[PDB]
Design a binder for this molecule. Structure first.
Ligand SMILES: *[C@@H]1O[C@H](CO)[C@@H](O[C@@H]2O[C@H](CO)[C@@H](O[C@@H]3O[C@H](CO)[C@@H](O)[C@H](O)[C@@H]3O)[C@H](O)[C@H]2NC(C)=O)[C@H](O)[C@H]1NC(C)=O
Ligand SMILES: *[C@@H]1O[C@H](CO)[C@@H](O[C@@H]2O[C@H](CO)[C@@H](O)[C@H](O)[C@H]2NC(C)=O)[C@H](O)[C@H]1NC(C)=O
Ligand code: NAG
Ligand code: NAG
Lengths: 231, 354, 132, 115, 122, 112
């Protein structure tokens, strides 16, 4: 069928936890093949390698090419443009992308286990909610004590758009299931959220047994010398 | 406490409004949360619009909020005003249950409807106005009286042959371009606040006691907001018209019991508390001048008035301007010695911070 | 409630005082002193994440709140000399009970990126930690 | 059904409620919210998809949902509910309710020592 | 620095301020007085001599000084200072400043507020 | 759903729970009981029929039922619930639970 061309921003985990930041420019809907080429406006090292094509719906050619080393121009607010010409269309196509403006930072919340899970004494679950952030890219990582847990032990959903009270914002959730003996020893668990709009690119919250559905509040205030010639 | 804005705000229905609040420009204060909330009764101080993207259901389509970090200001616009929006409000930063706020009062008045049989004139306090009254082709040899319904007495204290009030003396005339056609006029110089109300004009009388209304509104000036800090300086710009460019102008400070206190004159006066730290400049072709005050202390904050008179004091019937000043006192201006001593033949060395 | 003596933000304690020139016996009058403590119910003991459970005991020594140890300047004869202002400031080292709006508090967490690990830095109070 | 976090009630804007359903084997499920007795329209809340959760015994699934209501209605003492429909339930539905109480602690002990 | 005694404040004539400096091993010391930030002249106060005190092991010394001021401006809110210089102090000087508001109170009000909300202290 | 009179709570043998329905237009209900998340068989409780209440103007109805349960797990904290079925409800059912309505105790002590 008829072709199309798009442009994709770099992935979030490589801009936060990494060094390299590859853009990409793809070309789908091509009939058989091409000996095509691309165009990038900053080209101080633009080894735009292509690689092999893939096979798409019913039979289609889909080839693409990436551009390495573009982290600090992306963070400074620059602009990138891709444009390709090929046999199987009349005119060259074009596309552009830029770093987003007018963003918001998330509100992170970590919730204690429900009351009826603590009685059966087998496993408990903790919930991590992030809310109200403007681009839809986000990461979630869990810790036990001060050591990171492996990725295959929890479940994270996707970022979706919430009902509107003004500006459009997003939200995401996650749950982690831990042993009910570690909750009663006094171990602490922590939830980390990384986003484009946060100051140092990560923030965290922490919870344990004494903080959350506490059923007891103990506080003792001692004031030593209230009548004591304050100079 | 370092937060400042317009204390009272008035409008009518259907109109818009624009409110500005000021804060110290430190980097915590630029990135934190800004809010506009309605301090009602029964405990809470419910938020109406915020900086993070919250707009309430009642303010949908009507409002927005913009943060300007380099000014240290943020603005709130509210369109399509009603009469249920009269109450006490608050600017703020951060969390509502702390106190980094400022109180604002907003009153909305009912507009005009189905009583539009008058021709109103608005005028600044201490200026001229005209009250046109169509003379007709038979009522010349009567009295051209002008009542003003103090209560519901017809109080004739103006007649167009000299039968005047000792109250309204020295400033009322008439000038002739009538004698058959449909106008004469009376110019009123140096209006006061006392001279408001509804005027029942006439020009002669044919005996049905037929009535003509021509009402006026005299308004007191709106103060401009100035935001400075400790150990800094301020300038006022006094910009009255070219009509009074040969009068002696001045600048007082409003006190509690309706008492201006003269800070400077044009005939050579000064307070003792401003010795060494005040300037006054020669006026331009438009008759506009500037007053500079440096080394701002804590007690300098308050309302200021600049005016004009033959003697240099706040007298009634004089044109005025206004200001409201706030001294921040969470300043970032470095402290310095104020006095530096020396002996005859020796040296000094003073440090000057920018 | 008139003159501020102490406004401490490591412990969040504030002490004011006022001479109340009282009505009856009009040639004598009282000295009032107000103290305000705001107690956080969810802070830790050390300000890091996994330290120890939430603090449940809060101690305030008014001899430490009223302390003054920064040097001052005094004009004695025709001179400027520098003096101290206290007898006890042999030494930060104090424990804080609350945060402060004008200071960053960060942490360090190791996370994995396929191969090795890193030393990722995490903001604990996000409003005060923008680089500006 | 989880109570709202304490960090949120101090802003007077809106409070959020969280519903979680966990551990069901066929992945088809319904989520509806109520206020008192009135069912709310679909455009007022947000539910996610029904993913598969990481265990080793058998294959089970999970889903979440949030609803943000006004702070003045939370203060006045109104009740909100979360209903869930599944094949394996004997009466096809189950309901949980919440209000401004019952997250409040059981007892508080304060001691001031002026010495 | 010691505040005036309670039974001098009734007469409303003149009040006394005492300055005590204790426990220094050489026998040399300096004592000056200041009002506000203005040094008073030396003919307005009386300073005694430095003597050695009863031995708690090692030999240390002591000294005193008094100053009389008007009873009205102590109540108006002026501040006074006693300044002591000795060659063993690190910055060579030390100062104490007293006034009427920083003294032993009559009434004490204590309010303890419990904050579930935040831990930031605005 | 009404909690369990303290007069039989003092005896510590059994307690009675009461489910009450009121104000529905046709005389057709379904009442079932649960415990935790498991449904109880219908022979552990009794249920009356639908009488007509007299009130202002229109005619509505009411049903009641009573469950008795052991005080051991109720003292431990096991929870129970009552369901009501009707055709005027949008999702055909409602459900109210209960569990061991107590207020907060507050102890403040000052020591001089
Ligand atoms: C309260 O918690 C903070 C945060 O954990 C403590 O400060 C940190 O203490 C650790 C261990 O003493 C320091 O780690 C050290 O790092 C250096 C490299 O910079 C390395 O040479 C050492 O072997 C050790 O690994 C860390 O630097 C330090 N400071 C931070 C994180 O800013 C603090 O001691 C605790 N205070 C109390 C009273 O418990
Ligand atoms: C500081 O405040 C001034 C108001 O005196 C702002 O000036 C106005 O800005 C708007 C932009 O939103 C313009 O449309 C107006 O024309 C400006 N002038 C006036 C007289 O209203 C100014 O924008 C603020 N500072 C910054 C950096 O934005
Ligand atoms: C980016 O592409 C859009 C078309 O989607 C175009 O309208 C816009 O002007 C382009 N901007 C730049 C900077 O090329
Ligand atoms: C939104 O803000 C803009 C400022 O750019 C203002 O012109 C406009 O009137 C506002 N919209 C409203 C009040 O509906």
């Amino acid at each position: 069928c008829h072709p199309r061309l798009s442009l994709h921003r770099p992935a979030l985990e490589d801009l936060l936890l990494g060094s390299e930041a590859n853009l990409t420019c793809t070309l789908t809907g091509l009939r058989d093949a091409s000996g095509a080429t691309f165009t990038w406006t900053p080209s101080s090292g633009k080894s735009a390698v292509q690689g092999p094509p893939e096979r798409d719906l019913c039979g289609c050619y889909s080839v693409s090419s990436v551009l390495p080393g573009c982290a600090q121009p992306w963070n400074h607010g620059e602009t990138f443009t891709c444009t390709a010409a090929h046999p199987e269309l009349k005119t060259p196509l074009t596309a552009n992308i830029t770093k987003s403006g007018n963003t918001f930072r998330p509100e992170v919340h970590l919730l204690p286990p429900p009351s009826e899970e603590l009685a059966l004494n087998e496993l408990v679950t903790l919930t991590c909610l992030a809310r109200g952030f403007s681009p839809k890219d986000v990461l979630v990582r869990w810790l036990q004590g001060s050591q990171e847990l492996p990725r295959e032990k929890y479940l994270t959903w996707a970022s979706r758009q919430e009902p509107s009270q003004g500006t459009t914002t997003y939200a995401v959730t996650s749950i982690l299931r831990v042993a009910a003996e570690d909750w009663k020893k006094g171990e602490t668990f922590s939830c980390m959220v990384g986003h484009e709009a946060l100051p140092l690119a990560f923030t965290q919250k922490t919870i344990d047994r004494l903080a959350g559905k506490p059923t007891h509040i103990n506080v003792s205030v001692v004031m030593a010398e209230a009548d004591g010639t304050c100079y | 406490s370092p937060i400042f804005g317009p204390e009272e705000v008035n409008s009518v229905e259907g109109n818009s409004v624009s409110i500005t609040c000021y804060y110290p420009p430190t980097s915590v204060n630029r990135h934190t949360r800004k809010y506009w909330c309605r301090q009602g009764a029964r405990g809470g101080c419910i938020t109406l619009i915020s900086s993070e993207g919250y707009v309430s259901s009642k303010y949908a389509g009507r409002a927005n909020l913009t943060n300007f970090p380099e000014n240290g200001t943020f603005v709130v616009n509210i369109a399509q005003l009603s009469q249920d929006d009269s109450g006490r409000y608050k600017c703020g930063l951060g969390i509502n249950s702390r106190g980094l706020s400022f109180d604002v009062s907003l009153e909305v008045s009912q507009g005009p409807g189905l009583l539009n049989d008058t021709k109103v004139y608005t005028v600044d306090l201490g200026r001229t106005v005209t009250i046109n009254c169509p003379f007709k082709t038979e009522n010349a040899q009567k009295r051209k009286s002008l009542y003003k319904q103090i209560g519901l007495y017809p109080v004739l204290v103006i007649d167009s042959s000299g039968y005047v009030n000792p109250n309204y003396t020295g400033r009322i005339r008439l000038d002739i371009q009538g004698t058959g056609q449909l106008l004469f006029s009376v110019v009123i110089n140096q209006l006061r606040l006392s001279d408001a109300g509804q005027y029942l004009c006439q020009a002669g009388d044919d005996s049905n006691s037929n009535k003509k209304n021509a009402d006026l509104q005299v308004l007191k000036p709106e103060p401009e907001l100035v935001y400075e800090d400790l150990r800094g300086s301020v300038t006022f710009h006094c910009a009255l018209g070219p009509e009074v460019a040969n009068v002696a102008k001045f600048l007082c400070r409003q006190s509690s019991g309706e008492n201006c206190d003269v800070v400077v004159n044009t005939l050579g006066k000064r307070a003792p508390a401003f010795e060494g730290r005040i300037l006054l400049n020669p006026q331009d072709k438009d008759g506009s001048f500037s007053v500079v005050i440096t080394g701002l202390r804590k007690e300098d904050a308050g309302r200021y008035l600049c005016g004009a008179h033959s003697d240099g004091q706040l007298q009634e019937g004089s044109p005025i301007q206004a200001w409201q000043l706030f001294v921040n006192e969470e300043s970032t201006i470095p402290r310095s010695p104020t006095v530096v001593k020396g002996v005859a033949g020796g040296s000094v060395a003073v440090l000057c911070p920018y | 409630e008139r003159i501020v003596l102490v406004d401490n933000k490591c412990k969040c304690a504030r002490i004011t005082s006022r001479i109340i020139r009282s009505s009856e016996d009009p040639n004598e009058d009282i000295v009032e002193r107000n103290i305000r403590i705001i107690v956080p119910l969810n802070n830790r003991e050390n300000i890091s994440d996994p330290t120890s459970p939430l603090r449940t005991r809060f101690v305030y020594h008014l001899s430490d709140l009223c302390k003054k140890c920064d040097p001052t300047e005094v004009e004695l004869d025709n001179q400027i000399v520098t003096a101290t202002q206290s007898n006890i400031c042999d030494e930060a080292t104090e424990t804080c009970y609350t945060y402060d709006r004008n200071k960053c508090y960060t942490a360090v967490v190791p996370l994995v990126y396929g191969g090795e690990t890193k030393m990722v830095e995490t903001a604990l109070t996000p409003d005060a930690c923008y680089p500006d």
